Amino acid sequence: TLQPFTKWTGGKRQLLPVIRELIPKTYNRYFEPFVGGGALFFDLAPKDAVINDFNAELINCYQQIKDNPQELIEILKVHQEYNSKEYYLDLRSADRDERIDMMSEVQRAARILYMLRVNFNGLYRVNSKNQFNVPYGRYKNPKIVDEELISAISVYINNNQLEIKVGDFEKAIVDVRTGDFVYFDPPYIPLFTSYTHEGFSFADQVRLRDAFKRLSDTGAYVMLSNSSSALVEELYKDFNIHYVEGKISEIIVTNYEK
Ligand SMILES: C[S@@+](CC[C@H](N)C(=O)[O-])C[C@H]1O[C@@H](n2cnc3c(N)ncnc32)[C@H](O)[C@@H]1O
Ligand SMILES: [Hg+2]
Numbered sequence: 001t002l003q004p005f006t007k008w009t010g011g012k013r014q015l016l017p018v019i020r021e022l023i024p025k026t027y028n029r030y031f032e033p034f035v036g037g038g039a040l041f042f043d044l045a046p047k048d049a050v051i052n053d054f055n056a057e058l059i060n061c062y063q064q065i066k067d068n069p070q071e072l073i074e075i076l077k078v079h080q081e082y083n084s085k086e087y088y089l090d091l092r093s094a095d096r097d098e099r100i101d102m103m104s105e106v107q108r109a110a111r112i113l114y115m116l117r118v119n120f121n122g123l124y125r126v127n128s129k130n131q132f133n134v135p136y137g138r139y140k141n142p143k144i145v146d147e148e149l150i151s152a153i154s155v156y157i158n159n160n161q162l163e164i165k166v167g168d169f170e171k172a173i174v175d176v177r178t179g180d181f182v183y184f185d186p187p188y189i190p191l192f193t194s195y196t197h198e199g200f201s202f203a204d205q206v207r208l209r210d211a212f213k214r215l216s217d218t219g220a221y222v223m224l225s226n227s228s229s230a231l232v233e234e235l236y237k238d239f240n241i242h243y244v245e246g247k248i249s250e251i252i253v254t255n256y257e258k
Contacts, residue, residue: 002045005065005153006113007122008037010185016043018244018252024221025258027181033169034185045156052165052172054199057112059166064109069154075110076145083144085136088118095131117144170211178219184208188227209235216255224253
């Protein structure tokens with residue numbers, strides 16, 4: 001049935017079996033503050049939820065699937081027919097010459113979705129000027145539009161209760177009440193040593209932990225994914241730390257034992 005409409009860095013599809021076995025048995029509303037591709041969100045298909053991400057282009061994708069599914073599919077079908085390296089390169093440069101400012105939100109959504117489907121590794125990346133800088137891919141699937149899926153996600157969103165937010169995670173959890181369930185999947189701590197990053201800092205990791213604690217002290221179930229780093233071990237030392245994969249690939253923290 002439902003699943004992510006796009007590939008995304010840190011996507012949790014493969015981890016679903018483990019997560020499904022650790023989610024609380026009963027809860028109220030659902031929250032996913034670093035939504036990304038939404039693997040869990042779409043797997044749960046909550047009737048009342050709250051999703052958020054700092055990346056504005058990604059959220060626009062969610063908003064347009066909800067609001068203009070038909071037009072989105074039409075445009076995607078056009079990109080599909082004219083697909084070529086040359087085509088890709090000219091559409092990509094739109095964010096370097098003000099054309100991007102003249103494009104509608106739905107047109108912008110179609111542009112990014114198309115690019116991710118045909119570029120190198122389906123990677124989302126921009127340069128210091130916020131311009132997309134990923135090259136064209138090789139031997140990719142010529143089928144890049146999934147019509148029924150988009151239509152389905154749209155129907156679902158429009159028939160339920162969903163709050164779509166853009167901005168910092170902290171702002172997206174203000175309405176948390178006792179019994180709600182929140183799943184956090186922030187950018188992982190790199191494997192003390194200072195580190196370069198895309199945006200989330202260790203200082204932020206601290207802030208996040210503080211927020212985790214606050215929510216726990218209020219009566220909500222919280223889940224958090226991160227790397228198997230010692231810092232992670234020290235940080236949530238007061239909680240139920242789960243280890244995943246022998247060589248231990250990653251960690252999942254909970255404020256409970258169901
Ligand atoms: C690790 S990925 C989420 C992956 C998602 N679990 C999956 O299933 O597709 C982390 C997300 O955090 C978002 N993010 C980064 N900094 C943030 C911040 N300060 N507040 C909220 N979201 C943030 C990133 O844009 C990225 O989408
Ligand atoms: Hg996107």
